[PDB]
Design a protein around this ligand. Structure first.
Ligand code: TGL
Ligand code: HEA
Ligand code: HEA
Ligand code: PEK
Ligand code: DMU
Ligand code: CUA
Ligand code: PER
Ligand code: CU
Ligand code: MG
Ligand code: NA
Ligand code: ZN
Lengths: 259, 104, 46, 227, 514, 75, 144, 93, 57, 49, 84, 43, 71
């Protein structure tokens, strides 16, 4: 029996299945790109979803059901998430660096100007502005959700969270549409490269954040959160804000300044 | 602090009549960490503290540490023993050399 | 709960020093041989 | 070229390369001193039975061993940066020559007046003529006028390479899509060797550079005969 | 029982052991590759084949030694084993995630071995520069497999770094401030911060290369307005911090080894050592273009990067001097570990100093892409990082296993390795001043002598590696069980015996606030 | 005319824009004269410079493209 | 005398120059005569014999300073064994040269070298210090 | 309304820590103990649930070096560095 | 919906020595078995693929 | 009581040194290694053109 | 900036919901209005086979290897020009 | 550090066997590949 | 009787003596290097180019047949 407040996690098979599922996804992408087959990829993606599902299932079991998250365990988790977001910001930094590198010194091949010759940028005052208001709004509505949860108001917490997710989804659909309408593609030189890869990783994160808000939604439906202990919701809301900020930088950089 | 104040602190330290075994060891183990061979007067106060705690071996062990702390300055130890001879005689402390404990 | 103490906090056995010799040999030997055999493999392709 | 058992830099063929020999000498002195000082102190600390194991005070000796190294850095930087800015001075070239890197040989273009260009390939070992240097000789050398300021422009038409000639203190990377400049000026006539200085595939080791430095008058005739 | 213990671990000591084992095996692979390198260059001519097979070998040598030997042993092994013990912590903050940091490495290693198996391997250099690394000059799976390998190794270290940072900030005794943690713990956290900030940039860079190779992007392709040089910036933005990542945990273990065998209760100038690691840590983020002095950057830029790169010597100097000042007045115990540490102090200084030569862009024009660079970095890696690993390994073996090594055999192993690495790398200074380029399978005739000696040196090194395996065998075969350890009052990690139990610090230490 | 002189607008090791700019300059100049009934020979300087500086393959690739309609530069 | 594994948490004995008085006595259990000797030690030490004084020293401590500080012949074994395995390494290099390495390039043949050397001199390779500077172009020989 | 409170819903160790804190206790060692004068007659009382516990002694404020030792049930022991006194007070929680 | 946390707390705190990944009952075992089979299967499959891709066609 | 090094020290040292020097001298000079030393002072320049 | 409104007495749930319905969603309905208005197919430009566009250095791992992932026939020409 | 005598002492003879076996596990396979390099190079 | 010897600061005293030695050696070696290497190098270059005739050097090379462009 221990007399510290920290968590001694039961031996778990999820690290190994997450590792192996990583091997299957990367191995699978290789098989897809070079050996025209998607089987490996399909499997790795499947196990990864199963791994993620079971591993976070257990975190919920250990916390809401078994009580292992003392204030010290909770405090460790805040650092882990802060650090996680930090590494995500540096990842995006690589892609902004790439955008600013190419756009500030356009090479002869593009006509030595930005945007390149033969590229017709979207209007930042059109769906890009809409997308921006959608994300900024979902930041407001998730603050409302946080305050409702802290004031112990179940119904308005769920209502504000719902609104937040729907906004998230609206962004995704708008962006999907815009992708299809765009007269330029990923193969359209450095303009297409930097554009789709930066916004495309952003869109991936909007999907992840959304999924995470949804998990928070169902955990709330089942009364997991107390007015005072709800780190899963805090995490998701920090992550959601990171996502909103990344968009403000893409907007200002690539859509506005980059047009 | 001055050299004489240092020595006095240590003399007084070892002279406390009710000095226990832990304090004897603490004091010697601390003292040998400094860049000096302790003055004869300090070693005398520790030897006598050995007497009051009925510890003959610690008295010898202490003479050994003096020798050790002089490193290659072969002249220090024989000066210190010379200055402690009355005390050695008074308490019947044999030198490590006299006991054969200086031969490997 | 598990075995504790010298020779017991490891995933290989140290009960018999010869069987252990054989394990260690396979283990360090396989690692050191791999590059030589990949070179061989690459030279026998073209 | 390098010679057997060589220890230091190939002899300076240009004033800039001389400049680097002196700066290297100056630096290496500092490097020998400090490493021998460290080696010495190490041995000093390990050679006594005298001990002092109690707490030592750091906020005083840390000054010396912060200020000295700072000074020594400034004494390296000063000449370092002087040479750096010299290598960048405007110089007004009499001649511009281009070089394109390829897997695995170099091509030269002398296009100021006529349209002169040729490929330069390593002489295979089996076809070396008596006394020629293995891996180093090329079929078409890079004839240049001695004692004149030349502009070398360097680029690539496939992967990265890098154009180097150690005796002149030159190494300019060859990047496709980009045009790098450097200036060349030999003080002496002769043959000056170099080798591709960027991993570029199967024959990276086998695409050397030979400069032939002759008088203007022989360079002009050569150019003409090479059209 | 076995599977629950070793495939499902949540125990920081077991996971640390998985890491030491992985690292030791990687170390063997890496030694094979390096002998392949010196076999090819040990006489004039071609031994294996052209530059493609040779550079596949050179490339794997680097990836293996760095990502599979040094990082796992230092951060994964010593980090997991010692860091919790040193702060009286029951385990790491996220013991479950910690296990996935481990299990990502065998798959990652498989992908590196795969890439060398298919097509003609990745003969690109460990820096993987395009266009040579691109889908035209390196067509097929090899380079993509290499990129995926780096992805997995990268996720592994990033998750590792999050664990370490949280563990070290959040899990000390309530009375212990950050300024009462030992220097190894400090070195691990600063390394972790460097990992957290720099690996995602490499991630971004190699992903761009992946999409250029497979999705028709043109990040580094001029035809679409790209720039091969951009890749170099992204790689090196990570690449320089990476070297400090490889040496910092080293510095940490050196501090403990030197203090311990000096019979000293503490390192000289603790706060100056802390300051030093932070400074090196920060400076190491603003200097990456010293890897690019010949790509053709503006003179002002090259002047900045020369100066910012040199300043790193100040803080590093403070560390070197403090280690000497720790030895000063010591009661010196001439153990095998102390011998590695002394060797480290000196040889690292030499490699460090030649690193300062290279900081000068002027001279670097002539030194870049030659064996002079190769000599600098093997001094600080083969005689720096590796010497810290050897010292720490012999020092702490008895804690991990409960058995002792034969000191005499270990002193023999050190002498052999010392002769070996110096004979291998010293002459490479000569080859480099005189112009031998990097990444060559053969060299002009004039360079034959130094290449012959340097290869002979690599063989000596082989002998030391083989002997080391035998010495580890002997220890486990004889079974001399540890009894007593001196200085436990200032070496908490030893206070729970050898080996410590599966669970330690179930009841945390008591520390007064006063 | 010996070679393209130093150009204070392009003082660094990267000369790519120097080549490109003079290539554009020459062809814009050539167009302006051939528009306004004028002598192309005023444009001669830029042709000499860009010929000195620009790799053959660059010039050749750019000429083919002007002919094709795909020259991205504005002439 | 006899130390056990599971005693790691208890104070222990050590022979160290800079820790002259360990936390415990070397011998903690005394026999009848040892007990008598500890009683006798409460009296004047002048009444203790040399042998008894020595015996009391030995109960308290394991080795004397002279013993714990003694040098060994280990260096002979380390240096000798090092040289042996460095010796062994030449066997490997011999084997390598015999069975792995083919002949070297024809450009190392004696006559090839003689000619290449002339040419180097004709082209004035390293004329300031390195190579040609060491050739006398007048007396036509290597500078003495 | 509708959202549980910690009071209503905290369980396991979380609830233990929460209740104990309300009674002003620290069974899970979240707080750093306050030092006494550390004399023979006023030793620092070191709670434990076995017969020995590791003590870390920061002799003087701001030392970076922490002195570690096992404190055993029995008579008070002293810090090998500054001699301050500590006594084990076994059992319970 | 009604708050059923307390039942789930009861279920997962039940002293049966079962690791948290299995503590939910029989479904946990199935799902674990499927996951781990796909993982080990897929890995064997990837090795086979690597062996295939190692030789020219 | 004498240990391994008192009993075998001098022998290990003497024969380790002897063997080392023997086999390095033999490898360096009898198996046809090309050291490629400087021609300076050893090679007589010969006509090549 | 301080914006142009007020509250701050206490930022609670009522305030943030006030902001959700009184500022945020109205901004989204406005930009939704503006957008579903300036939309409507913009005339695709003349095709010109520029060399820095429609890049193909390796075929795509799907379809016929020549179609981008979210290929739109109306606005995305192939390397040879718009589609039938 | 102090330790107890070996629970299972490894004699010189036994150490010779272990040393020999160790060296041979590194030396034999690499030797075999290296010796046959020529038969690989052209085949 | 023996005289009281020095008993305090033996280690520090030893340190002082040898660091001053190490300084002295360093200056002594600086002197050496900047004479045996640095000046030797500057003088060899200055002496070589003082009366260096490049057309003569070229001509000897030309007559030895090393050149492609100049027979
Ligand atoms: C292994 C091959 C050796 C070949 C020797 C040369 C042949 C002579 C021909 C005949 C010699 C005479 C005529 C030719 C003069 C050419 C001058 C020149 O062009 O000038 C430049 C040249 C010439 O420089 C030299 O002048 C050589 C200096 C050699 C330093 C000796 C330390 C060696 C230690 C022990 C053995 C080596 C292995 C251990 C390495 C240990 C790492 C240092 O090239 C270098 O820059 C190489 C140095 C790289 C920088 C390393 C710096 C720090 C080193 C360590 C400090 C140790 C201090 C204590 C002293 C160290 C005691 C331990
Ligand atoms: C553990 C690894 C490690 C460390 C710690 C370092 C440290 C340094 N490195 Fe090095 N380096 C590598 C590993 C490392 N490096 C590797 C792999 C490569 C090549 C990459 C590739 O291309 O593949 C490399 C390549 C590389 C290059 C590019 C050279 C080229 O390619 O042309 C450069 C240039 O600036 C460089 C410079 C430096 C400098 C200033 C330091 C400094 O941090 C060192 C400072 C230490 C000291 C200076 C010694 C102690 C100080 C004193 C005793 C005080 C007094 C000193 C003075 C007054 C000077 N390194
Ligand atoms: C840590 C990194 C590391 C290490 C240790 C080494 C070690 C060695 N390296 Fe490495 N090398 C690199 C990293 C490293 N190298 C890099 C990054 C490059 C550049 C790659 C590129 O150009 O792209 C390179 C390039 C390089 C070249 C240049 C190739 C070329 O340009 O053509 C050469 C040539 O001699 C060489 C040789 C050696 C040799 C003989 C050793 C020997 O000293 C090795 C002897 C063996 C050891 C020192 C193993 C030690 C440890 C263990 C076995 C673990 C033991 C286990 C426990 C304690 C648990 N190396
Ligand atoms: C709706 C917005 C949300 C985006 C997500 C949508 C689904 C697509 C699939 C997954 C995207 C995941 C990540 C981003 C990576 C690649 C870029 C994708 C961005 C994108 O979706 O861009 C599309 C191209 O997609 C393409 O090539 C698609 C290529 C699909 C295969 C993905 C490639 C797999 C390689 C991924 C790299 C993984 C490495 C990350 C490592 C993590 C760090 C360790 C744009 O279409 P287009 O027809 O060119 O132009 C439209 C013109 N009408
Ligand atoms: C870079 C690291 C390399 C380290 C150097 C290797 C050191 C010594 C290698 C010894 O092992 C080998 O020696 C052989 C003989 O010397 C080989 O036999 C071959 O030689 C024969 C006789 O010449 C035949 O009996 C056999 O068929 C056989 O294949 C061969 O199999 C190989 O295992
Ligand atoms: Cu071209 Cu290397
Ligand atoms: O990177 O040094
Ligand atoms: Cu760097
Ligand atoms: Mg380079
Ligand atoms: Na070779
Ligand atoms: Zn204390």
């Amino acid at each position: 029996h221990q007399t510290h407040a920290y968590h001694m996690v039961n031996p778990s098979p999820w690290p190994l299945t997450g590792a192996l599922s990583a091997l299957l996804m990367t191995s699978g992408l290789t098989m897809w790109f070079h050996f025209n087959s998607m089987t490996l990829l399909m499997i790795g993606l499947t196990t990864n979803m199963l791994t993620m599902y079971q591993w976070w299932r257990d975190v919920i079991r250990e916390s809401t059901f078994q009580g292992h998250h003392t204030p010290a365990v909770q405090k460790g988790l805040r650092y882990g998430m802060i650090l996680f977001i930090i590494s995500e910001v540096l990842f995006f930094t690589g892609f902004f660096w790439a955008f600013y590198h190419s756009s500030l010194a356009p090479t002869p091949e593009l006509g030595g100007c930005w945007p390149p010759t033969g590229i017709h940028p979207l209007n930042p005052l059109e769906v890009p502005l809409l997308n921006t208001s959608v994300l900024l709004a979902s930041g407001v509505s998730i603050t409302w959700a946080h305050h409702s949860l802290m004031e112990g108001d179940r119904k308005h917490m769920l209502q504000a969270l719902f609104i937040t997710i729907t906004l998230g989804v609206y962004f995704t659909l708008l962006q999907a549409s815009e992708y299809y309408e765009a007269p330029f593609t990923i193969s359209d030189g450095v303009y297409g490269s930097t554009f789709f890869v930066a916004t495309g990783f952003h869109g991936l994160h909007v999907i992840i954040g959304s999924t995470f808000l949804i998990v928070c939604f169902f955990r709330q439906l089942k009364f997991h959160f107390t007015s005072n202990h709800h780190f899963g919701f805090e995490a998701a809301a920090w992550y959601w804000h990171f996502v909103d900020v990344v968009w403000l930088f893409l907007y200002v950089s690539i859509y506005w300044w980059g047009s | 602090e001055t050299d004489e104040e240092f020595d006095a602190r240590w003399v007084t330290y070892f002279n406390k009549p009710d000095i226990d075994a832990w304090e004897l060891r603490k004091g010697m183990n601390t003292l040998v960490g400094y860049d000096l061979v302790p003055e004869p007067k300090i070693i005398d106060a520790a030897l006598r503290a050995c007497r009051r705690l009925n510890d003959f071996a610690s008295a010898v062990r202490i003479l050994e540490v003096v020798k050790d702390k002089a490193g290659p300055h072969k002249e220090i130890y024989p000066y210190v023993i010379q200055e402690l001879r009355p005390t050695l005689n008074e308490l019947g402390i044999s030198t490590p050399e006299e006991l054969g404990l200086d031969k490997v | 709960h598990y075995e504790e103490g010298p020779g017991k906090n490891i995933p290989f056995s140290v009960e018999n020093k010869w069987r252990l010799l054989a394990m260690m040999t396979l283990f360090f030997g396989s690692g050191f041989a791999a590059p030589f055999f990949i070179v061989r493999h690459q030279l026998l392709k073209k | 070229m390098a010679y057997p058992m060589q220890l230091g830099f190939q002899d300076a063929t240009s004033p800039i390369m001389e400049e680097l020999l002196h700066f290297h000498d100056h630096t290496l002195m500092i490097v020998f001193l400090i490493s021998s000082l460290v080696l010495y102190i190490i041995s000093l600390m390990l050679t006594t039975k005298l001990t002092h194991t109690s707490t030592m005070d750091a906020q005083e000796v840390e000054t010396i061993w912060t200020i000295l190294p700072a000074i020594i850095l400034i004494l390296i930087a000063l000449p370092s940066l002087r040479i750096l800015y010299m290598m960048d001075e405007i110089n007004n070239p009499s001649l511009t020559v281009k070089t394109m890197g390829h897997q695995w040989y170099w091509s030269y273009e002398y296009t100021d007046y006529e349209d002169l260009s040729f490929d330069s390939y390593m002489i295979p070992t089996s076809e070396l003529k008596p006394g020629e240097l293995r891996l180093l000789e090329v079929d078409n050398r890079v004839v240049l006028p001695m004692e004149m300021t030349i502009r070398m422009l360097v680029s690539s038409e496939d992967v990265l390479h890098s154009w180097a000639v150690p005796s002149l203190g030159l190494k300019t990377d060859a990047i496709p899509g980009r045009l790098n400049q450097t200036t060349l000026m030999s003080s002496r006539p002769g043959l000056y060797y170099g080798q591709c200085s960027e991993i570029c595939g199967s024959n990276h080791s086998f695409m050397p550079i030979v400069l032939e430095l002759v008088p203007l008058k022989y360079f002009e005739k050569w150019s003409a005969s090479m059209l | 029982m076995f599977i629950n213990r070793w495939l499902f671990s949540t125990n920081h000591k077991d996971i640390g052991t998985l890491y030491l084992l992985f690292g030791a095996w990687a170390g063997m692979v890496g030694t094979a590759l390096s002998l392949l390198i010196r076999a090819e260059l040990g006489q004039p001519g071609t031994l294996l084949g052209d530059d493609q097979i040779y550079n596949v070998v050179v490339t794997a040598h680097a990836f293996v030694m760095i990502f599979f030997m040094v990082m796992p042993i230092m951060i994964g092994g010593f980090g997991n084993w010692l860091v919790p013990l040193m702060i009286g912590a029951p385990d790491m903050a996220f013991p479950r995630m910690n296990n996935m940091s481990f299990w990502l490495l065998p798959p990652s290693f498989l992908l590196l071995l795969a890439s060398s198996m298919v097509e003609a391997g990745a003969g690109t250099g460990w820096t993987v520069y395009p266009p040579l690394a691109g889908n035209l000059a390196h067509a097929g799976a090899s380079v993509d497999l290499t990129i995926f390998s780096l992805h997995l190794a990268g996720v592994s270290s990033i998750l590792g770094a999050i664990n370490f940072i949280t563990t070290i900030i959040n899990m000390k005794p309530p009375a212990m401030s950050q300024y009462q943690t030992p220097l190894f713990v400090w070195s691990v956290m600063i390394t972790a911060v460097l990992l957290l900030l720099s690996l995602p940039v490499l991630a971004a860079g190699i992903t761009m290369l992946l999409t250029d190779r497979n999705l028709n992007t043109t990040f580094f392709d001029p035809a679409g307005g790209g720039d091969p040089i951009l890749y170099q910036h992204l790689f090196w933005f990570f690449g320089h911090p990476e070297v400090y990542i490889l040496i910092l945990p080293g510095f940490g273990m050196i501090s403990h080894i030197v203090t311990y065998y000096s019979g000293k209760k503490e390192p000289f100038g603790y706060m100056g050592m802390v300051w030093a690691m932070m400074s090196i840590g920060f400076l190491g983020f603003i200097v990456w273009a010293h890897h690019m002095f010949t790509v053709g950057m503006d003179v002002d830029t090259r002047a900045y990067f020369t100066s910012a790169t040199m300043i790193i010597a100040i803080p590093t100097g403070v560390k070197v001097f403090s280690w000497l000042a720790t030895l000063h007045g010591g009661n010196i115990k001439w153990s095998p570990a102390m011998m590695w540490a002394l060797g480290f102090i000196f040889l690292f200084t030499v490699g460090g100093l030649t690193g300062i030569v290279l900081a000068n862009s002027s001279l670097d024009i002539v030194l870049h892409d030659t064996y002079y660079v190769v000599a600098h970095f093997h001094y600080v890696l083969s005689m720096g990082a590796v010497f810290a690993i050897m010292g720490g390994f012999v020092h702490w073996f008895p804690l991990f296993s409960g058995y002792t090594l034969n000191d005499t055999w270990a002193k023999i192993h050190f002498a052999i390795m010392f002769v070996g690495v110096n004979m291998t790398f010293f002459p490479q200074h000569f080859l480099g001043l005189s112009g031998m380029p990097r990444r060559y399978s053969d060299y002009p005739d004039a360079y034959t002598m130094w290449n012959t000696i340097s290869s002979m040196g690599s063989f000596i090194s082989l002998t030391a590696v083989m002997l080391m395996v035998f010495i580890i065998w002997e220890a486990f075969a004889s079974k001399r069980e540890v009894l007593t350890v001196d200085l436990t009052t200032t070496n908490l990690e030893w206070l729970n015996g050898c080996p410590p139990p599966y669970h330690t610090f179930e009841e945390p230490t008591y520390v007064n606030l006063k | 005319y010996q070679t393209a002189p130093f150009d204070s607008r392009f003082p660094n090791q990267n000369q790519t824009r120097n080549c490109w700019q003079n290539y554009l300059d020459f062809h814009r100049c050539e167009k302006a004269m051939t528009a306004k009934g004028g002598d192309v020979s005023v444009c001669e300087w830029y042709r000499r410079v860009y010929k000195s500086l620009c790799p053959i393959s660059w010039v050749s690739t750019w000429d083919d493209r002007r002919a094709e309609g795909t020259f991205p530069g504005k002439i | 005398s006899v130390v056990k594994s599971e005693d790691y948490a208890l104070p222990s004995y050590v022979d160290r120059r800079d820790y002259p008085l360990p936390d415990v006595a070397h011998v903690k259990n005394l026999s009848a005569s040892q007990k008598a000797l500890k009683e006798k030690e409460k009296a004047s030490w002048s009444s203790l014999s040399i042998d008894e004084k020595v015996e009391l020293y030995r109960l308290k401590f394991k080795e004397s300073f002279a013993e714990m500080n003694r040098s060994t012949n280990e260096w002979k074994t380390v240096v000798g064994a090092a040289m042996f395995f460095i010796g062994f390494t030449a066997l490997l290099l011999i084997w390598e040269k015999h069975y792995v390495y083919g002949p070297i390039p024809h450009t190392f043949e004696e006559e090839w070298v003689a000619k290449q050397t002339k040419r180097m001199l004709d082209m004035k390779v390293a004329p300031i210090q390195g190579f040609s500077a060491k050739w006398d172009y007048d007396k036509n020989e290597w500078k003495k | 309304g509708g959202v549980p409170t910690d009071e209503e819903q905290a369980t396991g160790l979380e609830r233990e820590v929460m209740l104990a804190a309300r009674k002003g206790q620290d069974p899970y060692n979240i707080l750093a103990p306050k030092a006494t004068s550390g004399t023979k007659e006023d030793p620092n009382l070191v709670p434990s649930i076995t017969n020995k516990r590791i003590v870390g002694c920061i002799c003087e404020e701001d030392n970076s070096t922490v002195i570690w030792f096992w404190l055993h049930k029995g008579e008070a022991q002293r810090c090998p560095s500054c001699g301050t006194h500590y006594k084990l007070v076994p059992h319970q929680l | 919906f009604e708050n059923r946390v307390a039942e789930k707390q009861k279920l997962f705190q039940e002293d049966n020595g079962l690791p948290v990944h299995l503590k939910g009952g029989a479904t946990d075992n199935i799902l674990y078995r499927v996951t781990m089979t796909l993982c080990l299967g897929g890995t064997l499959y990837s090795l086979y693929c690597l062996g295939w891709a190692s030789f020219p066609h | 009581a004498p240990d391994f090094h008192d009993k075998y020290g001098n022998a290990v040292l003497a024969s380790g040194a002897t063997f080392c020097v023997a086999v390095w001298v033999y490898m360096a000079t009898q198996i046809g290694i090309e050291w490629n030393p400087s021609p300076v002072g050893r090679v007589t320049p010969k006509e090549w053109r | 900036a301080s914006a142009a409104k007020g509250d701050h007495g206490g930022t609670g749930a009522r305030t943030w919901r006030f902001l959700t319905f009184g500022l945020a969603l109205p901004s989204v309905a406005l930009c939704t209005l503006n957008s579903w208005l300036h939309s409507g197919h913009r005339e695709r430009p003349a095709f010109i086979p520029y060399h820095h566009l429609r890049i193909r250095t390796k075929p795509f791992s799907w379809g016929d290897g020549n179609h981008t992932f979210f290929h739109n026939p109306r606005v995305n020409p192939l390397p040879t020009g718009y589609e039938k | 550090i102090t330790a107890k005598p070996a629970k299972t002492p490894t004699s010189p003879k036994e150490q010779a066997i272990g040393l020999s076996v160790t060296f041979l596990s590194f030396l034999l396979p690499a030797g075999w590949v290296l010796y046959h390099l020529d038969n690989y190079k052209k085949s | 009787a023996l005289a009281k010897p020095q008993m305090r600061g033996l280690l520090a005293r030893r340190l002082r003596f040898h660091i001053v030695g190490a300084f002295m050696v360093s200056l002594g070696f600086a002197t050496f290097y900047k004479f045996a290497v640095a000046e030797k190098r500057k003088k060899a270059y200055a002496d070589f180019y003082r009366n260096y005739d490049s057309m003569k050097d070229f001509e000897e090379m030309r007559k030895a047949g090393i050149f492609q462009s100049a027979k």
